[PDB]
Amino acid sequence: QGPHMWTISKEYHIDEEVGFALPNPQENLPDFYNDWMFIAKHLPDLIESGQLRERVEKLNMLSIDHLTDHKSQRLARLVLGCITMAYVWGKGHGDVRKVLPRNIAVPYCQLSKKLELPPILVYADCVLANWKKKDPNKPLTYENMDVLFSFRDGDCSKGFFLVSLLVEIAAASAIKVIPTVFKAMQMQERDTLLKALLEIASCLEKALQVFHQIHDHVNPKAFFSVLRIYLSGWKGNPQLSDGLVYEGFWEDPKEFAGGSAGQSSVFQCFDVLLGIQQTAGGGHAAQFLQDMRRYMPPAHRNFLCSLESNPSVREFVLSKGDAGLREAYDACVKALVSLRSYHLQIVTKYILIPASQQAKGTGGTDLMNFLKTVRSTTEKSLLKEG
Ligand code: HEM
Ligand SMILES: COc1cc(F)c(-n2cc([C@H](O)c3c(C4CC4)ncc4cncn34)nn2)cc1F
């Protein structure tokens, strides 16, 4: 019949409440994995004391066969991924391990192959599956939430991961409007389309207000001098120029990029929907965002290329000579420009200024240039405002 997004199929694994985030993540693994759980839950103490690497090297190789459902496999990825970052970087002062012991590398790679995700911590692990409600009968607010794992005391990982998650959830409230958009275009329902675009804009405007909470829960000194170390990967990294050896799984060292919000499917989703061709051309920013799709869960990666197969919303609006429809489309693009402009100020506070008192991103190239290119591509998609 063809690529028609008239409904969001349950096979895309997009939750009605939390969107691309993992709904009600599992907190405990079966008892068989207690040795992994003790290490993952005590990374601040084990790293600070210099005992982390020895505790990891003492592990027996545990089979992944006892992780029988999706949520336990996602929790185990988050546990193994946090342990791997702590093992590779240690205290973060130049003494790096270039070989991941087989006792963790083998189950980590087996589980990563099973979930079609690389054997490195991704945004879907440390943001989308790394959370819980303190009280299940209370709403999804910062006060009623916590992360499952942190790297070091005072690293601000709770604030950084949770505010990223909250923004991600706020933007997700617009996903349910996508089938209304495609259906209104197919059925030539102008008023329905206009109303749907304004609702998407409203959601993206609310996501910016949610972002303001970053200042209360993250401090620049801790983010840049402490958390930054554990967010780093091994692709174009001079500290691990050939990548990491996953002992017992692969013969040669392998390179994988560190976790990135370029792996967020909700932001890539609205750029695709609005025809902001962030992945077009052969430039660095476009190549990076396309590359980050292979670091997203497979159903979410599938949702994005499915959106790309649908008719263009931008081309539909551009061809109508309808001021009301063009304004509603621009309200969506404007809300993304506003988010990106505010995020540039956040990056200046949390990265640029601390770095100046001491910038390359996950892609190995200047992060300010990447962000400004992404923002500029969005601003240039406005049909009028200039
Ligand atoms: C302490 C605050 C923050 C800092 C320092 C920060 C830093 C960065 C950096 C360095 C990048 C470039 C990509 C990379 O190198 O991995 C990036 C991209 C991005 N960030 Fe953040 N970020 C912050 C907060 C947030 C929050 C709360 C969100 C909400 C989900 C967010 C969403 C994004 C998105 C979607 C991108 C991809 C580029 C774009 O779509 O404009 N960031 N961020
Ligand atoms: C030179 O100094 C630095 C360079 C940097 F690249 C970073 N860095 C990288 C990320 C990453 O993209 C990220 C993540 C990941 C954990 C998955 N999660 C949420 C998020 C929101 N926006 C970005 N997010 N955030 N900061 C930090 C640095 F200090």
DSSP string, 288-300: HHHHHGGGS-HHH
| Residue in the structure block whose two tokens are 């945004």 | 123
For residue 351 and ligand 2, the question of a CB distance below 6 A is answered with yes
Which residues form ligand 1's pocket by a CB distance below 6 Å? 160, 163-164, 167-168, 211, 214, 218, 223, 260-262, 264, 267, 340, 343, 346-347, 350-351, 361-362, 367, 370-371, 374
3-state secondary structure (DSSP) of residue 111:
helix
Q: Which residues are within 8 A (CB) of 101 and not within 5 positions of it... i.e. 6 or more apart?
A: 56, 57, 59, 87, 247
CATH of domain 18-379: 1.20.58.480
| Residue in the structure block whose two tokens are 């599938």 | 302
CB 258 within 8 A of CB 231: yes
How far apart, in whole angstroms, are the C-alpha atoms of residue 180 and residue 188? 12
Closest Cα to atom 12 of ligand 2: 260
What is the CA 30 to chain-centroid distance, rounded? 26
User: How many CA atoms lie less than 13 Å away from 75 in the CB half-sphere?
Assistant: 24
Q: Domain extents for the chain?
A: 18-379
How far apart, in whole angstroms, are the C-alpha atoms of residue 356 and residue 347? 13
**What six digits make up the tokens of 6?**
């008239």
How far apart, in whole angstroms, are the C-alpha atoms of residue 80 and residue 120? 9
How far apart, in whole angstroms, are the C-alpha atoms of residue 382 and residue 370? 20
HEC per residue, 192-214: HHHHHHHHHHHHHHHHHHHHCCH
What single string gives the DSSP state of each residue in 320-377?
S--HHHHHHHHHHHHHHHHHHHHHHHHHIIIIIHHHHT--B-TTSSBHHHHHHHHHHH
Please list, residue by residue across 266-295, b when 16 or more beta carbons sit within 10 angstroms of its beta carbon and e when fewer do. Answer: bbbbbbbbbbbebbeeeeebbebbebbbeb
How far apart, in whole angstroms, are the C-alpha atoms of residue 47 and residue 95? 12
CB 278 within 8 A of CB 374: yes
Give helix then strand counts, H and E, for the chain: 19, 4
Using alpha carbons, select from 53, 113, 117 the residue that is nearest to residue 85: 53
Show the CA angle centred on residue 18, arms to residues 262 and 24, nearest 5°: 110
Technique behind this structure? X-ray
**What six digits make up the tokens of 257?**
């990029």
- CA-CA-CA-CA torsion sign (140, 141, 145, 150): positive
Overall resolution, Å: 1.7
Cβ-in-10-Å burial (0-12, 13-18, 19+) of 125 comes to buried
Q: Which residues are within 8 A (CB) of 1 and not within 5 positions of it... i.e. 6 or more apart?
A: none
Closest Cα to atom 20 of ligand 1: 261
Using alpha carbons, select from 116, 146, 158, 170 the residue that is nearest to residue 296: 116
Using alpha carbons, select from 131, 125, 99 the residue that is nearest to residue 112: 125
Q: How far is the CA of 180 from the centre of ligand 2 (A)?
A: 34
Residue type (1 letter), 268 = Q
Residue type (1 letter), 293 = R
**What six digits make up the tokens of 331?**
């309200």
Q: Compute the radius of gyration of the chain from its Cα atoms.
A: 21
User: How many CA atoms lie less than 13 Å away from 212 in the CB half-sphere?
Assistant: 6
Please list, residue by residue across 143-168, b when 16 or more beta carbons sit within 10 angstroms of its beta carbon and e when fewer do. Answer: eebebbbbbbeebbbbbbbbbbbbbb
Gap positions in the chain, given as the residue before each gap (C–N > 2.5 A)?
358
Using alpha carbons, select from 207, 227, 196 the residue that is nearest to residue 351: 227
**What six digits make up the tokens of 356?**
């100046």
Please report the beta strands in the chain, taking only residues with DSSP state E, as ranges in sequence order: 99-100, 132-133, 145-146, 245-246
How far apart, in whole angstroms, are the C-alpha atoms of residue 52 and residue 43? 7
What is the CA 131 to chain-centroid distance, rounded? 13
Closest Cα to atom 5 of ligand 2: 361
Q: Which residues are within 8 A (CB) of 324 and not within 5 positions of it... i.e. 6 or more apart?
A: 194
